[PDB]
Design a protein around this ligand. Structure first.
Ligand SMILES: CCCCCCCCCCCCCCCCCC(=O)OC[C@H](COP(=O)([O-])OCC(O)COP(=O)([O-])OC[C@@H](COC(=O)CCCCCCCCCCCCCCCCC)OC(=O)CCCCCCCCCCCCCCCCC)OC(=O)CCCCCCCCCCCCCCCCC
Ligand SMILES: CCCCCCCCCCCCCCCCCC(=O)OC[C@H](COP(=O)([O-])OCC[N+](C)(C)C)OC(=O)CCCCCCCCCCCCCCCCC
Ligand SMILES: CCCCCCCCCCCCCCCCCC(=O)OC[C@H](COP(=O)([O-])OCC[N+](C)(C)C)OC(=O)CCCCCCCCCCCCCCCCC
Ligand SMILES: CCCCCCCCCCCCCCCCCCCC(=O)O[C@H](COC(=O)CCCCCCCCCCCCCC)COP(=O)(O)OCCN
Ligand SMILES: CCCCCCCCCCCCCCCCCCCC(=O)O[C@H](COC(=O)CCCCCCCCCCCCCC)COP(=O)(O)OCCN
Ligand code: HEC
Ligand code: HEC
Ligand code: HEM
Ligand code: HEM
Ligand code: HEM
Ligand code: HEM
Ligand SMILES: CCCCCCCCCCCCO[C@@H]1O[C@H](CO)[C@@H](O[C@H]2O[C@H](CO)[C@@H](O)[C@H](O)[C@H]2O)[C@H](O)[C@H]1O
Ligand SMILES: CCCCCCCCCCCCO[C@@H]1O[C@H](CO)[C@@H](O[C@H]2O[C@H](CO)[C@@H](O)[C@H](O)[C@H]2O)[C@H](O)[C@H]1O
Lengths: 383, 85, 244, 54, 244, 383
């Protein structure tokens, strides 16, 4: 017996990266998983390095980031790589989740990897939110203030919880130092959950774009998907290069180059772009607690896709109506993103409410109805 | 629902003969020009409507909303803005 | 929001540094330092820049040492623990005009002139905003604008009323390289200098980016060949089925 | 082609040695070539171009 | 190394706080504060202690506020950005005698009196060392000892020559509680106070430890019963073998 | 099929903590593994918490530790727990390694878990060394200075490497900030290697005090070893309580309550007690490079136990001569520890050399000879 199979440690690596039996027809949308692993590796390498030069104390934090930019050899690169890769991480994660929804990757027997995946997504949001605060610029401070004040909506104990989270009566030094410690930790937790969702997946194997079994026709992960992953790695690195070296501040907010000032409020307080759709959903509900619930529900509702999809067929490749509905759902999600950064003004207030209703009605009404009707059309249409 | 090599969980297979040639024996870019033009055109044409319809609808909606918002905050839009608030 | 509340958006000027392959014009950086030193430095600090940062960018080692040595900085206390001053060194940061915010505001009718070290990154528009703002004071505010006391009309500034008056007038500086010091010339130079101050890695970054682009593009092309090479047995597979 | 294959490619030890030596050469020559190209497209603008005045 | 190079080891004195269940004597802590304030504070800082730390340990809220309010601390600059002083608050730290190290050394013939906030933890011996040192200056150095200039003989100090002279003499302090202020009494009180300053959690820590000891001991006893209970089928197992 | 067996994630936990088949006769020396897991959990919880209040900048580090002691609620406890548990971690690890050597746990088929274990031990040393520097007291600074200067002995590049590690020309702010980042990281790396050595062990299962197979007579890990582990958990917590609450500074050096001062050199620069034997071994060799090699070799030589033990029998329970040799080896290791903290004076200089020779001769001469002779005695004695 080959050593890679005989030795228990080598055999674990073997089972995931080499002999792992894959469908022979995975398309390029199956490459986002390895891009997410790449983003995670970049964030760990750059993040640990930034931590060697960063000071978490509020009197020194912003200045330590300027020290990184100006004095540390290649500090500018490490900082810009870390900041831009956070954005790329969300592009890849949305693409990965989009793939999963389009191709029915959430259906049995893959409910568990999908459900762990939803938690990974929440952990990424928390990770990125805390990392953004560490700069301690104007957007850092005011973003932290507004977002942490949402916890005040928890009935009875909310206010007490906020003061507990802050370690004081407003966002300050105690908050920054604890966000540093937790920002360092959370990526390790995220790596563990990423590993867990892959172990859960390994019982059924990868799905494929046709939605059928691949047990009939398997291909080794290596060399086929190893070399196919390299193409998207280099495409990713080209995109990375264009942002990091030629336009490093395109995705950021200029106000985060102003040191945090609790007195002066910035003109507009918006989250980073990748949180904007959830911010639009929150704004749509007039009630404070209502808004918070809706915002959380917008993510947790992903957990019910296995139930509300009533199709007897996995994925959308052969479902014209479900493909149209998916297209509208995705574009609506992008419009929500845009509406998250407009001013609270007519006519965007009502538009945000309509888009929020559409977002939820996809899960609760449209997908159950469309999937039921398509079942009937497949049966009658082929009689 | 998945086994491993030798017992993958396929129904019994019989009667299929599979053939292929070595990567060293093949031209990897055989028919690339035909594929790049004709295959891509076929592939794109068949999916075009599923992208065009939602993109064009949501872009139209955005365009109308952003133009109205802009107009409401001009001098000319003063009265309509007062009603809207 | 009203356009006035946003501020007029600055034109896109063709900066020498615009362009994937373009550095700053270092002659413009040097002239812009001189504008900073003779005009802006009366009210604005540049606290993140040390004398050593100018060296091999705008000035020689000796010129920058001469600038540092003209100033006095706080030394370590003497042997009786009394305060002392020393001459400046290359390691020292360029000193600001005011000891604190309160002194800064008292000298500027309540307004606080920001530190200019990051101002090119801290405002939408960057160099274009700085250039537009400095050159965009109309002689007369548009009819109907009511300025608050100590405010000046400038359409580029959000709200229109800025606490900074116009400061650049033809010939307020005499450039040491003989360049005519017009309002426009000085604004262009100082905007370039401040852009450099915000991103001093700029020139090196773009050159390394060129190298990365080339290597990564070549690797992308080769990875396509290698993928297609390895996959051709799978792509080329043919079947004959004889139903049992 | 046979000769070239036999010497530099057939043994992986030799192939890897050849790749690494080529990477060394590439790295040094590419550096020099980019430096010169960068200086030509940005002629008159860099410190090295105005240094002589001071 | 010789015993002299090490310093004489201090006796083990029976401190009130020695003993797993024993707190500090707070009356001694209060008296020791008074010794600090009237004797040691001329040369030694206590920089890690704030006025609020005395409250409910040695002093009431009002007594500590009175101590703070007698002093002047640096305020934020006024509206013209000029420096200002304010009266002290409970949040303020106890101010040291010297502005810097250089001033401290100049006043003490080159020697630097350490901050006393951690001194009980920063020396082997703790309270015993402080007590032994303060009370261990012989009238005459042992015959043959050559003291460097500005040094005093003290056998507890490593090397024997210390830059601090004897400072505690009978009646240098008049205690406010009527206790006779002998050298020994003052040394005991100040050593207790400094031990508290190094470890202010001491009293609470030992009480929580008592609770932990009790709970953990009971849990240990119960875990033994439960282990034995669960294991008895394995321990009690019997075999009969009939060779096939 | 029971869910704990059916579900792949639950089944992994099941295989390690519940259904895991254990020998029925493990003695209390098999409890150190779970105590090490407990130390690791305590260090993670207390360490992450300290990181929320600690400032890594050299101007603030020592003061941030005083802030923890004085101002943070239960900060004294969290700090003392972290400092004392570092010592308990080494007591438990020496006990665990002692068990492994006495009972022949390094023999086939357990060479791989033992070899990974040797790396865990090295990672613990590095972790603890860096954490000790973070206080930035006198022992922190001077300990870092002398230990990092050992790298200067690497020929040709040694000095350059030291300046690279320091981020400057002496131990200062750059060093402190990088040690913080790496001290945070290293426990996660250690956890991974701890998991790896257990996965490697799972192929053979635990050894047992008799050195025979347990395949004939297995017990479930739960409830038997779960409840047996609780006894030592509570015994450990009693020891922990006595140090943390009643004598929190007993294991520490008073000089670490003096802020780092590059001018003043402390009277004696010694490592923490758990590193003292290796320090004695270093001192024994007069050459700088020689000393460094010997010190590293003293740990790496553990890797050759599987080769130099020539016994046909696993472990020492039935080997009177091996037991005596083991006793002398252990006591010699303790004497080396004591000699690591004496002054470099007669007659301790020569004694340290003799003890160093004895340490190495155990592996290279005595164990191969004694184990060869015992083989012959077993055979001839039982004819
Ligand atoms: C971020 C980091 C950078 C890394 C890049 C990773 C992106 C790779 C990826 O997943 O997308 C490439 C991906 C190519 O993947 P593929 O494996 O060749 O095909 C996947 C489907 O079979 C493609 O579906 P198809 O075979 O039906 O082809 C239709 C498609 C693609 O047409 C092609 O011929 C390609 O044509 C369109 O673009 C849709 C029509 C829109 C017209 C306007 O492009 C698309 O599928 C784009 C369509 C998405 C809408
Ligand atoms: C914008 C709207 C996109 C709608 C897509 C409709 C289908 C289509 O034309 O796509 C081409 C292809 C069609 O592929 P296919 O697999 O359905 O068809 C292959 C060809 N046939 C039918 C012959 C077998 O679709 C994809 O590849 C879809 C992947 C979805 C990824 C979406 C990312 C959005 C992120 C938001 C997260 C929340
Ligand atoms: C100090 C010297 C210790 C020598 C031990 C000799 C054996 C003995 O009496 O131990 C009792 C027992 C004897 O156990 P046993 O398993 O050999 O015998 C059980 C009883 N009979 C023989 C009937 C089956 O030994 C142990 O339990 C030894 C564990 C070793 C742990 C050592 C820790 C030291 C750490 C240093 C690290 C480097
Ligand atoms: C962390 C983020 C990862 C992304 C890396 C992309 C570019 C970063 C490289 C730094 C850089 O600017 O290098 C340039 C060339 O880029 C290049 O040529 C690098 C592009 C190569 C792409 C990826 C190939 C492997 C990289 C990752 C492996 C790292 C660990 C494996 C051992 C020019 O810099 P220079 O040429 O002046 O440099 C001195 C040697 N002459
Ligand atoms: C991390 C280190 C782990 C070791 C814990 C030991 C004690 C720490 C707690 C503080 C303490 O002293 O508690 C005392 C009681 O002891 C006790 O009752 C605690 C002893 C119990 C030890 C084991 C119990 C659980 C430990 C870890 C489990 C983790 C799960 C959830 C945290 C004082 O009591 P108080 O008055 O301060 O109490 C407040 C409510 N009255
Ligand atoms: C004697 C006073 C004075 C001089 C001279 C001066 N400034 Fe200012 N500047 C100010 C004050 C006051 C503000 C704050 C204005 C406000 O916020 O209302 C300001 C604001 C600015 C801003 C930020 C406007 C914004 O968007 O917040 C920039 C950029 C600026 N100055 C650049 C310059 C440059 C470049 C020069 C000269 C070459 C210059 N200043 C000369 C007083 C001055
Ligand atoms: C007028 C000067 C002066 C007075 C009064 C004074 N000290 Fe000191 N003390 C010093 C100097 C100077 C040193 C440093 C001695 C040296 O390092 O040689 C010192 C050192 C010490 C040390 C540390 C010795 C060591 O081991 O490093 C302690 C503890 C101490 N003093 C406590 C006190 C206490 C308690 C009092 C009074 C109740 C006191 N001192 C009064 C000047 C003074
Ligand atoms: C999933 C992985 C991670 C994500 C998504 C992430 C995200 C972010 C973001 C968005 C910022 C703000 C960047 C900026 O605008 O300047 C940031 C800053 C930071 N992150 Fe992370 N991060 C990750 C991992 C890590 C890790 C593992 C560390 C290890 C400490 C770390 C350390 C830092 C530090 C020190 C900063 C502040 C300095 C700076 O702004 O660049 N990060 N992170
Ligand atoms: C750190 C973030 C993540 C990483 C590194 C990661 C990695 C991967 C990898 C490598 C695969 C197998 C290859 C592939 O299909 O792309 C995969 C599959 C999957 N992931 Fe993720 N993932 C992450 C986040 C998520 C999230 C947020 C979700 C869901 C909300 C998710 C759900 C899934 C599902 C359902 C599959 C199986 C898809 C299939 O093959 O049909 N993952 N992931
Ligand atoms: C973080 C440190 C460590 C942890 C948490 C850990 C944990 C454990 C656990 C739980 C076991 C199984 C139960 C037991 O026998 O006690 C075990 C077994 C073992 N460990 Fe460790 N260990 C650590 C460090 C080490 C080190 C430093 C070594 C070796 C130099 C080592 C070598 C072994 C070996 C050889 C076994 C199998 C022993 C046998 O059953 O015969 N481990 N370890
Ligand atoms: C194997 C696990 C660990 C060991 C053996 C260890 C060891 C140590 C040691 C010996 C110290 C010096 C303690 C003192 O005398 O004050 C220390 C300090 C520190 N450790 Fe750890 N540590 C571990 C895990 C962690 C983790 C996971 C963190 C997370 C950040 C951490 C954060 C700290 C911090 C902030 C300090 C400095 C504050 C202080 O001295 O208490 N440690 N560590
Ligand atoms: C992704 C990075 C690479 C590192 C590997 C990831 C670490 C996770 C591995 C631990 C999880 C246990 O992983 C589990 O291992 C065993 C053997 O290794 C696999 O078992 C599989 O392969 C082996 C042979 O290769 C067969 O005996 C078995 O029939 C088959 O199911 C499981 O399908 C996998 O779920
Ligand atoms: C100790 C910490 C607790 C968490 C557990 C550690 C998490 C990572 C462990 C997974 C690594 C893979 O570990 C591997 O898992 C499989 C199934 O789970 C075990 O497999 C074992 O149990 C299952 C049933 O319980 C049997 O089918 C199999 O015959 C047997 O070998 C392997 O013996 C173990 O080596």
């Amino acid at each position: 017996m080959a050593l890679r199979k005989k030795n228990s440690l080598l055999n674990m690596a073997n089972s995931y990266v080499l002999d792992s039996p894959q469908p022979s027809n995975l398309n390029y949308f199956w490459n986002f998983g390895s891009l997410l692993a790449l983003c995670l590796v970049i964030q760990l390498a750059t993040g640990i390095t930034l931590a060697m030069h960063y000071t978490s104390h509020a009197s020194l934090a912003f200045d330590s980031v300027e020290h990184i930019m100006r004095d540390v050899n290649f500090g500018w690169f490490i900082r810009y790589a870390h900041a831009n890769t956070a954005s790329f991480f969300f592009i890849c994660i949305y693409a990965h989740m989009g793939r999963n929804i389009y191709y029915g990757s959430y259906k049995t027997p893959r409910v568990l990897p999908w459900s762990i995946g939803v938690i990974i997504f929440l952990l990424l949001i928390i990770t990125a939110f805390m990392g953004y605060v560490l700069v301690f610029g104007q957007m850092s401070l005011w973003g932290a203030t507004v977002i942490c004040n949402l916890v005040s909506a928890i009935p009875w104990l909310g206010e007490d919880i906020v003061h507990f989270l802050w370690g004081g009566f407003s966002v300050g030094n105690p908050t920054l130092q604890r966000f540093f410690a937790l920002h360092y930790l959370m990526p390790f937790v995220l790596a563990v959950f990423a590993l867990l969702h892959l172990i859960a997946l390994h019982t059924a194997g990868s799905s494929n774009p046709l939605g059928i079994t691949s047990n009939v026709d398997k291909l080794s992960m290596h060399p086929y998907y190893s070399f196919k992953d390299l193409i998207t790695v280099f495409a990713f690195l080209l995109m990375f290069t264009l942002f990091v070296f030629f336009s490093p501040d395109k995705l950021g907010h200029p106000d985060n180059y102003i040191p945090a000032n609790p007195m002066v409020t910035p003109a507009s307080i918006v989250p980073e772009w990748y949180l904007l759709p959830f911010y639009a959903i929150l704004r749509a509900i007039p009630d404070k607690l209502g808004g918070v619930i809706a915002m959380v529900a917008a993510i947790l509702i992903l957990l019910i896709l296995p139930i509300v999809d009533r199709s007897i067929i996995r994925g959308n490749a052969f479902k014209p109506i479900s493909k149209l509905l998916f297209g509208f759902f995705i574009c609506n999600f992008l419009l929500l993103g845009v509406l998250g950064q407009v001013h609270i003004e007519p006519p965007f207030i009502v538009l945000g409410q309509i888009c929020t209703i559409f977002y939820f009605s996809y899960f609760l009404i449209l997908l159950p109805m469309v999937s039921t009707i398509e079942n009937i059309f497949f049966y009658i249409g082929s009689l | 629902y998945m086994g491993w090599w030798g017992h993958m969980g396929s129904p019994p297979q019989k009667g299929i003969a599979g053939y292929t040639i070595s990567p060293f024996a093949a031209r990897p870019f055989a028919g690339v020009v035909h594929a790049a033009i004709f295959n891509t055109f076929r592939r794109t044409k068949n999916q075009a409507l599923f992208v065009i319809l939602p993109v064009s609808f949501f872009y139209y909606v955005w365009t109308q909303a952003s133009e109205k918002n802009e107009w409401l905050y001009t001098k000319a839009g003063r009265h309509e803005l007062a009603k809207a608030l | 929001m009203t356009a006035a509340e946003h501020g007029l958006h600055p034109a896109e000027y063709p900066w020498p540094q615009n362009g994937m392959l373009s550095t700053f014009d270092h002659a413009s950086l040097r002239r812009g330092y001189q504008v900073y030193k003779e005009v802006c430095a009366a009210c604005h600090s540049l606290d993140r820049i040390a004398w050593r940062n100018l060296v091999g960018v705008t000035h020689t080692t000796d010129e920058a040492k001469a600038f540092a040595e003209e100033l006095e900085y706080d030394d370590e206390p003497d042997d009786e623990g009394n305060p002392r001053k020393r001459p400046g060194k290359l390691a020292d940061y360029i000193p600001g005009p005011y000891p604190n915010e309160q002194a800064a505001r008292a000298a500027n009718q309540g307004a606080l002139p920001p530190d200019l070290s990051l101002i090119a990154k801290a405002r939408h528009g960057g160099a274009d905003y700085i250039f537009a703002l400095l050159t965009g004071y109309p002689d007369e505010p548009p009819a109907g604008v009511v300025l608050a006391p100590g405010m000046n009309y400038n359409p580029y500034f959000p709200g229109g009323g800025i606490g900074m008056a116009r400061t650049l007038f033809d010939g307020v500086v005499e450039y040491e390289d003989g360049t005519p010091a017009t309002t426009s010339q000085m604004a262009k130079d100082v905007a370039a200098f401040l852009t450099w101050a915000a991103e001093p890695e700029h020139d090196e970054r773009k050159k390394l980016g060129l190298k990365a682009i080339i290597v990564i593009s070549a690797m992308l092309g080769l990875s396509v060949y290698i993928k297609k090479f390895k996959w051709s047995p799978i792509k080329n597979r043919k079947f004959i089925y004889n139903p049992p | 082609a046979t000769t070239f294959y036999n010497v530099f490619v057939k043994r992986n030890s030799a192939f890897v040695a050849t790749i690494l030596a080529s990477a060394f050469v590439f790295d040094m020559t590419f550096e020099t070539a980019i430096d010169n190209f960068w200086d030509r497209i940005n002629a008159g603008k860099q410190w090295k171009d105005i240094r002589h005045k001071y």
